[PDB]
């Protein structure tokens, strides 16, 4: 077990291994309680996140466990990974604080987007889809993909993260309200909204609320057809839909005027209202738009992820003990 040192940063106490030096708060609360640090083991800059009141309630304790399980799972170039997790505690009874260490990323896509060049759009969306193929293969759904959850270094290498840009702007209509029926392609909707905004410089669906959000979405993609309406089990949802004056699907070529026609064709496949018909991440990687980058031998799937804990109703100290187990069993990447 390593030697720790104590300091106070912008109102928060930080007890970290001497391995991590030169701690400097980043963002403000945008990312949580996060410090840029120098990792003396590797000679790389890292980010250290100290979880806030991780075991204050059952729900905090389960969120803490969930975050650590997800982070320990992720082993892909386009997904944030866990470099280290540590507690200053020497025992479970002493255990109250959880620090996570990741790569320090350069900028988010919110603090980048001005238009981008079509080549930079191809590469960034390619990497998002490559990461999504990976987490979708583990039956993980991001559910809050948006530009602030995407980080990109000066080299344009991109990682998917979740720090949690209104979420509603990027959210699939089927999970805008009554979230009882959806699939992995809720994330593909979000990618379509992100790609549109990289191409145009403008939020595609800047809804002021959930009702304005659905209105903007149906304006572009049209009101549900007969085939989709047959699949809506919520009577309230059906009554809302069928009370709207009918609207045709726009020709996306007439909306994204001047865009690469292959980018427009991929947007048409991502922003399909019917989630049964929406392109998957694996399918989208094989789309002609990514001809320059697609390598079907270098788009790996994930190991299976046991999310059986999500269904469990446990006490604070149980979630705490499980979290402690995961800290102890952590094996750093080589
Ligand atoms: N602020 C940070 C950090 C940071 O906070 N690291 C620490 C950090 C800790 C956790 C996460 C995270 O994602 N928890 C959820 C994990 C599982 C999801 C992964 C995705 C798929 C769905 C499951 C993220 C970060 C690193 N770089 N920058 C940074 C960025 C831009 C500019 C300047 C600095
Ligand atoms: Na979403």
Tell which one of 63, 102, 159 to mutate to probe ligand 1, the residue whose CB is within 8 A of the most ligand atoms.
102
Centroid of ligand 1 to alpha carbon of 248 (angstroms): 40
State how far the Cα of 82 lies from the Cα of 303, in Å rounded to an integer: 16
Pair of tokens at residue 219: 């304006």
What CATH number did the domain enclosing 228 receive?
A: 1.10.510.10
Active site amino acids:
162
Residues contacting ligand 1 via CB (< 6 Å):
26-27, 31, 34, 47, 49, 67, 70-71, 74, 79-80, 100, 102, 104-105, 107-108, 135, 140, 142, 151, 160-163
State how far the Cα of 116 lies from the Cα of 19, in Å rounded to an integer: 39
State how far the Cα of 184 lies from the Cα of 9, in Å rounded to an integer: 39
Q: Which residues are annotated as a binding site?
A: 26-34, 49
Tell which one of 63, 80, 110 to mutate to probe ligand 1, the residue whose CB is within 8 A of the most ligand atoms.
80
Tally Cβ neighbours within 10 Å of residue 240. 14
- Resolution of the coordinates, Å: 1.8
Residue 303 backbone dihedrals phi, psi, to 5 degrees: -60, 150
Pick from 61, 85, 60: nearest CA to 72: 85
State how far the Cα of 238 lies from the Cα of 248, in Å rounded to an integer: 18
State how far the Cα of 26 lies from the Cα of 10, in Å rounded to an integer: 11
Residue with the two structure tokens 């999310």: 307
**Geometric angle at alpha carbon 78, from 161 and 297, rounded to 5°:** 155
Coil vs helix vs strand at 161: coil
Pairing of β 99-103 and β 107-108: unpaired
Pair of tokens at residue 328: 């102890």
Residues in the chain: 334
Domain region containing 226:
107-290
Residues paired with residue 45 on neighbouring β-strands, in sequence order: 38
Residues paired with residue 14 on neighbouring β-strands, in sequence order: 7
* Chain centre distance of CA 227: 30
Whether the CB-CB separation of 132 and 191 falls below 8 Å is answered with yes
Q: Which atom of ligand 1 is nearest to the CA of 74?
A: 19
Whether the CB-CB separation of 164 and 144 falls below 8 Å is answered with yes
Pick from 229, 176, 220: nearest CA to 200: 220
Coil vs helix vs strand at 200: helix
User: Which approach determined this entry?
Assistant: X-ray
Centroid of ligand 2 to alpha carbon of 38 (angstroms): 34
Centroid of ligand 2 to alpha carbon of 226 (angstroms): 25
């Amino acid at each position: 077990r390593p030697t720790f040192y104590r300091q106070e940063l912008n109102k928060t106490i930080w007890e970290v291994p001497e391995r991590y030096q030169n701690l400097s708060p980043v963002g403000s609360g945008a990312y949580g309680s996060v410090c840029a640090a120098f990792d003396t083991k590797t000679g790389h800059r890292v980010a250290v996140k100290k979880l806030s009141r991780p075991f204050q309630s059952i729900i905090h304790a389960k969120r803490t466990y969930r975050e650590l399980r997800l982070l320990k799972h992720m082993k892909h170039e386009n997904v944030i990974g866990l470099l280290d997790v540590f507690t200053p505690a020497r025992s479970l009874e002493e255990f109250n604080d959880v620090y996570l260490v990741t790569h320090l990323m350069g900028a988010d896509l919110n603090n980048i987007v001005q238009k981008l060049t079509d080549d930079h759009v191809q590469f960034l969306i390619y990497q998002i889809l490559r990461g999504l193929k990976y987490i979708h293969s583990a039956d993980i759904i991001h559910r809050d993909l948006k530009p602030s959850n995407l980080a990109v270094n000066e080299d344009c290498e991109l990682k998917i993260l979740d720090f949690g840009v209104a979420t509603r702007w990027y959210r699939a209509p089927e999970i805008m309200l009554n979230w009882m029926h959806y699939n992995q392609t809720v994330d593909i909707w979000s990618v379509g909204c992100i790609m549109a905004e990289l191409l145009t410089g403008r939020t595609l669906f800047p809804g002021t609320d959930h009702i304005d959000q659905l209105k903007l979405i149906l304006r572009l993609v049209g009101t549900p057809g007969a085939e989709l309406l047959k699949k809506i089990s919520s009577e309230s949802a059906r009554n809302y839909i069928q009370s709207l004056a009918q609207m045709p699907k726009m020709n996306f070529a007439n909306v994204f005027i001047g865009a690469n026609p292959l980018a427009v064709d991929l947007l048409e496949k991502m922003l399909v209202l019917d989630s049964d018909k929406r392109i998957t991440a694996a399918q989208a990687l094989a789309h002609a738009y990514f001809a320059q980058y697609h390598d079907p031998d270098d788009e790996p799937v994930a190991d299976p992820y046991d999310q059986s804990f999500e269904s469990r109703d446990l006490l604070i100290d149980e979630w705490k003990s499980l979290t402690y187990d995961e800290v102890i069993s952590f094996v750093p990447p080589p």
